Amino acid sequence: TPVSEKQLAEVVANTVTPLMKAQSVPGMAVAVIYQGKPHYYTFGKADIAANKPVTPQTLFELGSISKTFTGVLGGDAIARGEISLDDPVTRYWPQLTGKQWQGIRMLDLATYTAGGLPLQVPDEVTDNASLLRFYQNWQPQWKPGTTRLYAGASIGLFGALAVKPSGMPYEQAMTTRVLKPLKLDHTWINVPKAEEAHYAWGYRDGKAVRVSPGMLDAQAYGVKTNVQDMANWVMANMAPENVADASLKQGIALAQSRYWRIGSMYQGLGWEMLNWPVEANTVVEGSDSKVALAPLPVVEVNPPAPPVKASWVHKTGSTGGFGSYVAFIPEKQIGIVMLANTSYPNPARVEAAYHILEALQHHHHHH
Numbered sequence: 032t033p034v035s036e037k038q039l040a041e042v043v044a045n046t047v048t049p050l051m052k053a054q055s056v057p058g059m060a061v062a063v064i065y066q067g068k069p070h071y072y073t074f075g076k077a078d079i080a081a082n083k084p085v086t087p088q089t090l091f092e093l094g095s096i097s098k099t100f101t102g103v104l105g106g107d108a109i110a111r112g113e114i115s116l117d118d119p120v121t122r123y124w125p126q127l128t129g130k131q132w133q134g135i136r137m138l139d140l141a142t143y144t145a146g147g148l149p150l151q152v153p154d155e156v157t158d159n160a161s162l163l164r165f166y167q168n169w170q171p172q173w174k175p176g177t178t179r180l181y182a183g184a185s186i187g188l189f190g191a192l193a194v195k196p197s198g199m200p201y202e203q204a205m206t207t208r209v210l211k212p213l214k215l216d217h218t219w220i221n222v223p224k225a226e227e228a229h230y231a232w233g234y235r236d237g238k239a240v241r242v243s244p245g246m247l248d249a250q251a252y253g254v255k256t257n258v259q260d261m262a263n264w265v266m267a268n269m270a271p272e273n274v275a276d277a278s279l280k281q282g283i284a285l286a287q288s289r290y291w292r293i294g295s296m297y298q299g300l301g302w303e304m305l306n307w308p309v310e311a312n313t314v315v316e317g318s319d320s321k322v323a324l325a326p327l328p329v330v331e332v333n334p335p336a337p338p339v340k341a342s343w344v345h346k347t348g349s350t351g352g353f354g355s356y357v358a359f360i361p362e363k364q365i366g367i368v369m370l371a372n373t374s375y376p377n378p379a380r381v382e383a384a385y386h387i388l389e390a391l392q393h394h395h396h397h398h
Contacts, residue, residue, distance in 0.1 A: 034394045036070065039063060042390045043072045046383050047369075051075060054375035056354075057234055058085040060258035064269065064359065064366040065391060069262035077231040077372065080239065090222060090230045090255045091370040092242050095183070096348030096355055097254035099268070099286065100209060101190035102301025105141060106282030107208050113196040116141060123192035129167045139175045140189035142290050142298045144329055146171030146178065148185040156246045173326070179293050180326040183251035186301065190250030201249050212276040213267050218256040220249040229257065231372045233352015240352040252350060261357065261368045268302070268344070269359040269366050287344060287361075289336035291329040297336075298329075299344075307341040307360055311385045318347060318377040347381070349374040356380040358388070365391055 034042075043061055051059055051074060058075040073085045108114045114123070116138035121127050123137070131146075139145040148169065156165050166188070172178075194204040202220045210218050222230050232239040242252065256264070267274050267283065274280040289297040289304065295313050297304045305314060316322065338361065345358035354374040358381075359366025367384045 032394060032396060034065070034391060038394065039065065039070055039391070040072065042394075043387055046386050046390075047072065047074055050375075050379065050383050051371075054373065054379060056371045056373045056375060058089070058231060058372045060085050060087065060089060060091065060368075060370045062258045062262035062265075062368040063387065063391065064262060064266060064364070064368075066364065069259070069266070071258055071262070073258070078239075079232070079234070085231065085372075087259050088217070088229050088257050090217070090219070090226065090257050091355060091372065092233060092252075092350040092353040093254045093256060093261075093355055093370075094242070094252045094348035094350040094353055094374075096261075096346050096357060097249070097252050098183075098186050098348070099264075099301040099346050099357075100205060100254055101186055101193075101250050102141065102286040102299060103268070103279070103282050104205055104209050105189060105193040106285035106300055107279050108193045108197070108282070109285055110278040110281035114193055120145075120188075120192065123195050126163055127166055129169075131169070131171055132166075135175045137189060137192065138290065140185050140192070141300050143179045143182050143185045144176050144291065145182075145185050146173040146175050147180050147326065148182045148188075150180075150182050150184070150324065152184045152187060152246050152251070154245070158246070162246050176331065177329065178326045179291060179298065179329045181324055183247070187247035187251035191247060205249070209279060212279050213263060213274070215256070215260045215263060218254060218260045218264070220253050220255075222255050230255065231353075233350060234373045235352050242350040242353075252348070258368060258370055261370065265357055265359050265366045265368055269361050270364060284338055287338040287342070289332045289339070291331060293327050293329055297332070302344050302346060304339070304342040304344050306339065307343050307362060309343050311382065311389070314343060314345075314385055315378050315381045318381045320377065323347075323377065345381075345384075347377045349377075354380060356384055358384055360388070363392065 340362035
């Protein structure tokens with residue numbers, strides 16, 4: 032039942048064309064990973080005003096898909112013996128002397144279980160001193176390890192602390208330990224002026240926009256990349272047996288380990304996982320912001336379960352002007368990347384991606 036390029040191209044087009052119309056998406060780049068190989072599909076415009084078409088080289092903002100890079104870099108640090116998820120946060124930031132921090136572990140930051148850290152670091156925070164004030168002033172609503180509340184302020188901090196023992200700035204640690212080893216040479220925390228010709232504009236309510244700088248931006252939402260590098264990132268995570276760098280391979284395994292169970296999802300490091308087989312509605316309902324952003328009770332997996340091959344591993348991510356999603360099933364060696372220059376509802380992303388991967392697993396051969 033080996034699905035031809037043409038039949039794959041038609042499946043993708045048949046889902047993506049109507050999606051971009053219904054959601055008013057100017058531009059989309061799609062990769063489908065199938066039998067060891069990425070396949071690329073591009074639609075519409077990277078830049079409306081200048082009439083520039085999306086290509087497999089166009090850069091998109093990943094928004095929260097950046098957190099998968101943070102989890103893997105953090106896993107690489109663990110594999111290097113530089114940090115432990117079991118360590119108190121104060122071990123890496125002794126300045127966090129507030130009593131509410133006793134009992135909060137690097138594990139908790141990494142997996143949103145610290146007790147209610149907020150969705151974003153406050154816009155008022157502009158430097159180290161104001162960042163410290165923020166964490167020092169923060170009053171948790173729950174005790175550590177009891178409630179998951181998805182938060183860029185939690186994993187963002189985990190990412191900044193993870194790299195401290197390295198003595199490298201985060202961008203340098205990420206480039207040296209993750210991006211260069213995987214040959215992700217068009218993946219940027221800061222897009223160079225030389226690369227700006229490839230950088231899509233984002234769109235929100237008719238306005239051209241790009242993500243604004245912020246504290247812990249690189250760790251929580253600041254990665255930009257094209258559909259080729261993103262496909263290669265998904266492949267490294269889908270088939271870590273192909274990752275020649277040993278500590279990075281082990282980091283990838285740690286980022287897909289199961290730390291907590293929250294209903295039908297398990298929380299990895301940045302990555303989230305549902306067991307396969309999973310029905311569309313279960314994945315789609317999960318991505319609705321009424322569930323995705325809610326504080327929910329966790330069940331600890333003790334010790335953390337190592338990666339399960341029969342998983343739907345995925346991550347959504349947005350910025351003001353961008354909406355993206357990636358998913359893969361390591362058992363089946365298939366996966367999808369959908370990068371867009373408008374932030375449209377997460378359940379619409381998941382439904383499309385799921386439809387395409389389902390159509391790839393249940394293709395017909397009758398003509």
